[PDB]
Amino acid sequence: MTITPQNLIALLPLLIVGLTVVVVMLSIAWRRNHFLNATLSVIGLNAALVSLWFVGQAGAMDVTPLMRVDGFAMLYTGLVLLASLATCTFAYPWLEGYNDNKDEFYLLVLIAALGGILLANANHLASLFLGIELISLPLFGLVGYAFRQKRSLEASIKYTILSAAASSFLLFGMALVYAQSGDLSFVALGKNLGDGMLNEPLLLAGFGLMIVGLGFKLSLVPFHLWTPDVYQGAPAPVSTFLATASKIAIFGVVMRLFLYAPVGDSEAIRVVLAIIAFASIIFGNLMALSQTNIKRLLGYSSISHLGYLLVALIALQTGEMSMEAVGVYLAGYLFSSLGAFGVVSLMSSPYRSYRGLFWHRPILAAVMTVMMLSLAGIPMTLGFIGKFYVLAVGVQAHLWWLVGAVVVGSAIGLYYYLRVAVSLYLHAPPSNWQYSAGGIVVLISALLVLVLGVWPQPLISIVRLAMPLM
Template sequence: MNFTVTDLSLMLPEIFVLSMACIILIVDAYLPERLRDLTYQLSQGTLVGAAILTLGIQPESSMLLMSDLFISDAMSVVLKSFVYLIVFAVLLYSRAYLHNHKLFCGEYFVLVLMATLGMMVMISAHHLLTLYLGLELLSLSLYALVAIQRDSSQASEAAMKYFVLGALASGILLYGMSILYGLTGTLELSEIAKAIATGQIEPQLLSFALVFIIAGLAFKLGAVPFHMWLPDVYQGAPTAITLFIGSAPKLAAFAMVMRILSEALPDLHHDWQNMLIILAVLSIALGNIVAIAQTNIKRMLAYSTISHMGFLMLGLLVAKPDGYSAAMFYTIVYALMSMGGFAMLLLLSRAGFDAENLDDLKGLNTRSPWYAFIMMVIMLSMAGIPPFLGFWAKWAVLSQVVAHGFIWLAVLAVIFSVIGAFYYLRIVRLMYFEEPSDTAPLQVNTDMHLAVSVNGLAILALGILPQPLLQVCIQSIS
């Protein structure tokens, strides 16, 4: 392998995050309990430093690094920047919850940073091997995070399910990649595309490999019919971990799908387009319908995630830059909304009590009109109601679907979105028109209050002026 100083300089963010994770692991082992907050501060500093490095060394054009294993391009810079932002907010949101549930430990922060490193590697991967290594680093960190509450049988069960099904998904994806390697003789994404473009490979064999790859990707996205792990993991994991799983990794999953489908397999788009149509329709339908029956809000948001992943695939199946940019916009918007929704559950939780059921939101307007307003903004945005940001995310995707002739698909998506609006509006009704079942005053730290407020107001402000964020996505893809 040949690499230069330029390669190392462009990979400084990854090197920095890895180095800091190792330093934090060692430092935390010798910290007295009264200085435990230093681990949190170092972790936040790591994310800020990585953001500065990523934005500071941004190349003017796309560059291949490390013998074409890595790529530094506009899409990777934008996605990594949002990963840093979201993980920073996740750690801030989780701080009080971790203290109250005796989970504030160095292992949590190291695993979060290692998962962040895995996401960074996935986002910049230009080789199937690099992509798989990043995916496994992320997955293994998430398995351990789900099981971090060792005295909780529910968390242990969720971690076991996640591990078994995640290993199955990884095996399926790896099998598809190995078949693709056997057919093309390379693992580099652009070389795979060139080999397929020659037309000398048997189409049936390529389709066989594609089935396994799409199945593995669908597992990671949580798309129907490979969604069975998602509700159990969301419910069983501590809420701080569910917050992390439900936000930043979606950006890495989008990057993984983009790298494989648009860069390695563009000439097979007729095949994977049909597969994505089936997955998208099933995900939007099942996610919105089953969510109505849920009384646990974490399970409800899990099925909501499944439906949102269906919308994400609507943008991808267009197989054009406009569709990809709409899907990227949707992914970023969903990560911001999901982060805000789970953050509100953390805000309502306290020592010995987790806010997980719909009844826990009853009468929130009586206890705190401001937090009820923020939660209403997030829920209406998830439902796709204007003028909130979620409306423009759905509009961006559906407009591309219609523009490329899939009018029936857009009609189905709209119908199921209307059905799905019921369970979001139900939360608004509970907050504003029911008497509170818990009258205990909300104890909220200043940093948590500011972060939740900024999160909710950003969703409202970007809903009024969505063009800047959408333009960033368009430019990064083009």
């Protein structure tokens, strides 16, 4: 299929972010200016976020034998773009203290955002693979951006080796799937099977290797052991981006792949993902019980939240609001993780103990305790709305083991989240507008969490508007 001007206007955030990559690269080639390159990157990401309006007025259509644009793609593109914008905003005061070159950071953030947009728009195995790699490799650079530090270099090496292994696993999986089916489109993965013979062994093994790669990319048990180390060792804006944008884009493409494929309603795949989600929730909540480090704690939190996401994933073909639950939960999780990792970044900036935070930084302490109440699914917070959606979807499809796992993991998460949120207020022994901009970002994130936890109807209507093709 050729490309039309309507297909070009469907390509608007991808083209805008790519043009931003080229412009920022040429500006770095002209003269190394941190402020101007950061401003150009933020301008390009905001331009793509604005041009999502024109993409929405363009309608839902198919641009490539690879790409499909609908409201689902707009919602995930907007989430990825917002996460990238917050990552740049948090990264500028951190990069104010970096002795080496700071301008490549925003180039890598823009390329990873480009990969996230491609993963949001992906309707093909090639686009899935290229979006995963386009997210992964700039994250290899960003995790080891402070390569002089021991922890950052260790996390970069671990992430690079493990993600190369997961990329090979995923690629061999789609190789087996394409050997079985003969078409790499999402809709044709198992379309040549009928009369109850959907569980062909080669297709199931290829999808299993794809599950191995994606469950690495989604921090799902037992491909989750990288998450606390890579989260801790990486810089805190990089931890923010890796927690929000990569996970959201990869889960969106997994959502689209399991909706569109005929093999997605297989019983064996459903049971395997049920086991993975159960173990992910239980293990991620249990392993964060005795964590004194905030970053590893939030990595195990990411594992648990992705387990709740997979619980919402499993009931896709049976329930009707599974995608709506995933969208509401992902908006809430983006806001909560953005706020928490942003306060962590603002306390880690510039590049050179959360106890007693209220006595010198009260606003950041309030924002942190709002997000740790949000990640626990406490009412008046958007994470509660997401957990309620997950529980409703689990109750509809009679996923009782998953529902009990969500309740037990919620209790354990309540324990450690409240431990940190109340360690904030105990007793223990800047001056630029970009730090204030990061503070405004985390403050609006906390206000959004509180308002959409009290009044979740506009977000529900927005997510219900983001309906993919049938």
